[model samples]
Target: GNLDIAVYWGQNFDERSLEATCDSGNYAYVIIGFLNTFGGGQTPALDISGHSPSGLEPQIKHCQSKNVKVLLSIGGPAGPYSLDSRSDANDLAVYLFNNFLLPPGHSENNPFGNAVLDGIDFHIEHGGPSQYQLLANILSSFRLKGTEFALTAAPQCVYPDPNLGTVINSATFDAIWVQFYNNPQCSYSSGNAEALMNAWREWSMKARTKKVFLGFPAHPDAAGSGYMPPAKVKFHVFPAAKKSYKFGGIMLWDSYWDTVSQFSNKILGDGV
Candidate 1:
């Protein structure tokens, strides 16, 4: 009842349609994964397997009708995406805003067609920090009277994310979604919450974003480790994590794996 979950959708062929995911009312945000190629003499692209933004326009609008904020995430784990130069960041920002958030004059190639997404999310796994900061800065400038666009980031829970470290502090973010799986140094392991909570505490304290989300994998196979049983999350993690005002909610890696684990469903059963 209290948790506001965000799930990363797309990337998996088996995942539910964006409309169904939002209609489920299990999430407050649905982030589409990986505009994997951009700003390197490469045309920016959106890859949601078996789907296109144009193809899913009606579904996306339906999701928004359900009050689910749809965001397009740039960069995934396996990526050659990165800013080739500092100037690329400006172009990237322009493309992102005009194409996704609020387009001035819709380009014929605008992927989402008539639908305007809520904002952009950085799931940068391949790039370094340098130009992303500039990109964030430029994109942050498009906010209308302090609202409309919601800027976000997904960083590994390693205190300072190697890719977005500079951007996280310097740029304005609506939220920071920290990945608490795959990295054992901070992710939950040995049936203990110490390392995981420690990372949460650090993110709460350091991230300048208005909200800090504790990201998790829907299943043990979703990442290397750090899949807390639903009960463990509700009983052990949330009780402690909610102590910090910045704790917005948990973010799931993707929608398909979640079908098997149904982690979000259990968390929402009573909500922590």
Candidate 2:
């Protein structure tokens, strides 16, 4: 297929002793057990689960060796661990940008290490206005350091609020993941692919810069869940969205569910 796809298999979390074992020991090949070996086509970002992981340098090094980019995805639907403090927000972002985004010779991981991450993806679903500002400041400060890495975010897909645009502009992000499936507080009667597209169009007009990407859910439900059988889902929105020149691209919520041939095939069109 011509379209690009990425998977989310949980990285940096170290939720279990097994994950710790894999991360601690240069065991990427062992952890990615059943997954793709080469790691390029769908670019699965090993999310720095929350904050950063211990011995992060080795984790990034492992992913890079496998040709995978380990991106730090901060904020989520619920809230970040340090959402109450602007200081924590700023510190985390700065720490990542300065140490990971910037070239070698900076931060504690220098002298013998030369590691630079690809970029960052902010998933801000909760928090206050100040929190948003803190995020913007982090991105700005990082850019000022003189490294050219992509910065992106996943914004609310409910409405085309001007404030969202304002925050995005302040952050100087390269792109956005417009949540089409989990937002707008949908209902079975109201949620539709066209409705989601409408929201994106509205934001496009409002945001002067930054690419607006489509975010769909792999799990199908009536309301927030835009779940559908693969064949049905394909005919639902892909074709219509493709014709929209303004469209940036499509991103799936989780790779586990969507990887099934039913939906993945439709979302990922056959090669022309």
Candidate 3:
């Protein structure tokens, strides 16, 4: 219950692509192995591409069959909502739950069936202040619809700002994933992790104490700009855990970038 590991799939979905990166036996080897030690869902990075990964449904089903929860992540840095649509945020929630269909495949035997999605992770990368409330309304509606999929948001790991205020105060989500990278003013040497942890603590005390998840870009391609490296990842992890932050979990930006070679003999292999 103390450790939750997730991965993000940013800017990689295209119409032709199907199946999550972790389901490819690459990240699965790392995650499934880790699950045997520290249990949690292996949520796949999802987008609004209108289609699930080709064989991903089966993989999700398999993971769930083994009791591992899988969730579909929405939104990203490239953009979360479609630029041309204006559907009611609440309706969109229903659309996502019904049409998207969780865990790839489900039937009568599955108690959770389609509803296996433990929750939705929000990765709102860019938008004006208005989108903040819009995002919150959508997630809140999902919870109201009897879909208790834990709602989470991936926000910048910086002090309270205009754009972030609405969502933070709305109290709609279950966790806030504070991204340690991409904050122009912070650095690993500048107590960046500590600063972010403090920021979340302050927000929770003043507003709602929703769970917090440390967001890290573990693989080389995770940065999108290809600046990600093992050192950057270690910097994010060691500090966050060492400080005893009340975190809900750790979410990698994407499983594709988490190189198995780097984790071969690491703690990931130790299953500790």
Among the numbered candidates, top lDDT falls to 1
Ten consecutive residues with minimal summed lDDT in candidate 1?
A: 101-110
TM-score comparison, 1 vs 3, better candidate: 1
**Model 2 TM:** 0.65
lDDT per residue for candidate 1 within 1-272, as digits (tens), equals 46789999997876788888888888899998878888778878767786866877898889988888999988888766889588789889888877777744634557887788898998988667868887887787778545477889999999788888888887488898999999888988998889998888889998888899989999989988888888888888887877888889989987988877888888888332
For all the candidates, what are their Cα RMSDs to the real structure? Answer: 1.9, 9.2, 8.6
Q: Pick the candidate with the highest TM-score.
A: 1
The order of the candidates by lDDT, greatest first, is: 1, 2, 3
lDDT of 2 by residue, 1-272 (tens): 25544333343343332223233222212111111111112222223344243455665576666655445455554422333466655655655665557776644553114667666666655444446567667676767777766666667666543235556766377667666664444211243556555675576666544466666665663226554444644565567656655556655555334434324455554321
Candidate 3, superposed: residue stretches over 4 Å from native: 10-54, 79-87, 101-116, 131-135, 189-207, 224-245, 260-269
Please tell me which model should have the higher lDDT, number 2 or number 3.
Answer: 2
Candidate 1 stretches greater than 4 Å from native: 144-147, 270-272
- Provide the global lDDT of candidate 3 against the true structure: 0.47
lDDT tens per residue, model 3, 178-244 = 6756554332333344554455455445545446665556644445322334454445554554454
Q: Give candidate 2 regions above 4 Å deviation.
A: 11-69, 79-86, 103-115, 161-165, 169-171, 184-192, 221-224, 229-234, 259-262, 269-272
